Each structure stands twice: as C-alpha cells, then as structure tokens.
Amino acid sequence: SLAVNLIAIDSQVLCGAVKWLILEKQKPDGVFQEDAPVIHQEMIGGLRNNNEKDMALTAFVLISLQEAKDICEEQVNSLPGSITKAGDFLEANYMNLQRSYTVAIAGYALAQMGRLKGPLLNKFLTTAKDKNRWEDPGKQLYNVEATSYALLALLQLKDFDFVPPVVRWLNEQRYYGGGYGSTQATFMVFQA
C-alpha cells in the first residue's frame, strides 16, 4: 500500500489477496485467524506474545485493509462490511484489554473508523505514562513498537497538543532500526 507510490504494484493481485483474506481468512463475527504463523517468529515483534493475541491480530489486519481501502474499494464491494464486523468485535471487547501494546494498536484501528471516543479514548490516553510513551514491562523494542501505533493514532485523531512530547521522546531514544527481531519495530517507527 505504501509502494504504489514507488513501483507498479499489480492491483488485481493486491485486491486478490484482499478478497482472499476477506472470504477465506475472516470469521463471520469479524475475527481474523492465522492458520500458518511465519517461520521467523522474531519478525512479528510484540505479536509473538500470546496474551490477548486474537484482539491484536485482528487490529493488525484491520489496519492493513483500511490502508488499502482506496485501491480495492471498487474491486471488492464487501470491504466496508468486513471492516464493520471487525470494528464491532474490537469495540465490544476494548475495555477488557490490559497490555499497552494491544491498546495502542487497537486505538489506531478504532481512530480511523472514528470509534475511539469517550471511555475508549480516556483509556487510550491514561494508558500512556509520563505523557510521552505507551510502555509495557519488558524490552524497549516492544515499547517503541507500541508507541509508534499510538503516535499514528494521535495524528489520525488530529489532536496535536499531546504529539510533541511523544515525538521528542522518540528522538531521545535514538533508535536506528535493524537488529535481531526488529522487523515490526523498524518499519512502524519511521512511518510514524
């Protein structure tokens, strides 16, 4: 979805993968299910953690489909209905989340649809600590990965009073990507 501005990605194949994900790899209630995890388990980052895995995997694919919505909106007419089912599932079980990583990635998915409001928005804000990061206990690699999703959520919500401390904290980390198990952390931080 990012490389359509750089190289000629085939629209039929791209939307064919979207149609395959909607029809084959989506449960009727909105949950996306993976039937073959990748061999390299270090490239998935924080999604390797099996706690609250079903909610996090659903939000990851929902974000990917919404970013490719403009290209395959005309190709697949069931794309908005698929997003609606996934949004209702995430919205109903949003308040039960505990991990800061899961809340951050779900916040950006809900913010694109416009459902991150009220108590869901209050939970998203209070999840941050020191008003500049969304951190979980463990390696810094996962915390920067989670913070990248939340920074994109603030830009989606168009609330910039809280953004400068977040961006200032990211530069203070001096993270330059790369390294064993850095695929998701390196890719999302520079997108933000």
Swiss-Prot record:
Highest taxon in the source lineage: Eukaryota
Effect caused by changing residue 54 to A: No effect on binding of C3d to CR2
Disulfide-bond pairs as recorded: 15-72
Subunit note: Interacts with CFH. Interacts with CR2.
Protein name as it appears in the record: Complement C3d fragment
Phylogenetic placement of the source organism: Eukaryota, Metazoa, Chordata, Craniata, Vertebrata
Gene, per the UniProt record: C3
